[PDB]
Amino acid sequence: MQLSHRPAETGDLETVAGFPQDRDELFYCYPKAIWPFSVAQLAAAIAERRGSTVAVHDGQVLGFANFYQWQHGDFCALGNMMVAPAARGLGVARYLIGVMENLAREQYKARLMKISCFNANAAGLLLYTQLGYQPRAIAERHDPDGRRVALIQMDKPLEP
Template sequence: MSVFSCRAAMPEDYPLICTFPQNAQELFYMYPAGKFPLTPEQLTAAVKERWKPTVVLADGEVAGYANLYGLVERTECYLGNVIVAAAYRSQGAASELIGQMITQARDELNVPKLKLVCHHTNLQALLFYKKLGFRPFDLRTMKGLEGETVVGLLMEMELSRSE
């Protein structure tokens, strides 16, 4: 079993992170505006508009990535660009990573609410986020890879202070 930890993402991590989406659909789930294959340049551009880019490490190796966006000071922010390398899925890497993002949103960005958008076709992620305590509160429609309608379920979690 891997030992997980988290740290701030660094530009030298981006080439490896770009290999995590295995196909265009996985990239769409992670970063709907991205073009497959993901490149370090795309990731660099996305990070400029985000907060707290973070990697999860498995025994010291980068195993996943996420960041925060849409910050409304003292109100809310969104979890974004979540991806875990295929070799580390269903092993606890995502739970460790999301836990770190929750902590950063609450303790460093001082927001009481963390939100996310998860596509209706990503059933595994929907169930995972529900298990972590996120609850649906709205729907958003968007165009998918083939121009089809995709529903984004907006989910949120109240962040309580552990003081």
């Protein structure tokens, strides 16, 4: 997995917007989105966020991430994290988290990275644990069917 990264570009939107495969995945990816996902919804998210980045392998955009919160000298929080179905389990999310941690450190002088993960996302919970994130709190959210879900709020220190 040769991976590279760069800021997201308008030409990447269609591909990235195709990453969520069903309403639940979209909810995890982007809770305020409405199924079906679209390039316009993705572009609106990008405009409201910071650090929108794609991961590329063999000429293909395989992952997307950004920050939904950023506080200089303090912390950043992972926003959207989306990975192409064919590329899941291959280190794309791991790679992107590392890139976002560096950008938190460098651009925002962050001491902490926050990651929230919905309870159904076992693969996320397990990966973030492997990367040294620790659970701090559990919040209640509601899914698109109005069912109660648990949001596991995790964090990790970042040094200078």
